RNA sequence: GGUGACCUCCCGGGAGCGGGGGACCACCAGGUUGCCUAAGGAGGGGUGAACCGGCCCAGGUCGGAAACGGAGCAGGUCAAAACUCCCGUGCUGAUCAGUAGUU
């Protein structure tokens, strides 16, 4: 239950910083989905679980392609980093951003 | 000096979110002014909706165990998106009396 949250808004290049986004547009992507996010995180060997029915507070678009939240574990609950490659939320996001595009395209 | 946006960094957080460094843009107030006008007030208003302003936001809604918060509707509201009318100012058609002043 002590896992960092991650909304797809954080990575969406068609959203302003005030609309949620957490990473520079240059590194961001178009319309990332919680599904896409979970898949690229898990596939690197991260412990991730997907909450299909959480919405972003700042998200306004009531249709399914923008719903969703991805929870990720960084820590084994002895305080140590599950992985050394992923110390921070930002380190997660930037990676997901880097990996999502190799899927569909 | 102010407002609103937008971009890019840190920092704290399980969320909504919290702390802080830069960059840029728009507008505002009112303090000096000009290689400035034919004349250019630092006026007065109104719209600000079907989503585009900003603010306050019932409900609802998203996040939350909750506190509370986000986004924001109906309604209210504006020194400060944008739009627009009026006043002033400048040129510029025109009207009336057959009015004069003087023939």
Asked whether the CA dihedral A51, A90, A37, A8 is positive or negative, the reply is positive
Element (H, E) at A97: helix A89-99
* Secondary structure (3-state) at A91: helix
The Å distance, CA of A66 to C1' of B6, is 23
The secondary structure of A37-77 as a DSSP string is HHHHHHTTT--EEEETT---TT----SGGG--EEEE--B-S
Q: What is the DSSP letter of A10?
A: G
Nearest protein residue by Cα to C1' of nucleotide B63: A57
Tokens 């998200």: give the residue: A59
The Å distance, CA of A61 to C1' of B1, is 40
């Amino acid at each position: 239950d002590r896992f960092i949250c991650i909304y797809p808004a954080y990575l969406n290049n068609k959203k302003t910083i005030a609309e949620g986004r957490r990473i520079p547009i240059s590194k961001a992507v178009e319309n990332p989905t919680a599904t896409e996010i979970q898949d690229v995180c898990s596939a690197v060997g991260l412990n991730v679980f997907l909450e299909k029915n959480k919405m972003y507070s700042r998200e306004w678009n009531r249709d399914v392609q923008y719903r969703g939240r991805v929870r990720v574990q960084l820590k084994q609950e002895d305080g140590s980093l599950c992985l050394v490659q992923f110390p921070s939320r930002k380190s997660v996001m930037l990676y997901a951003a880097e990996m999502i595009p190799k899927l569909k395209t």
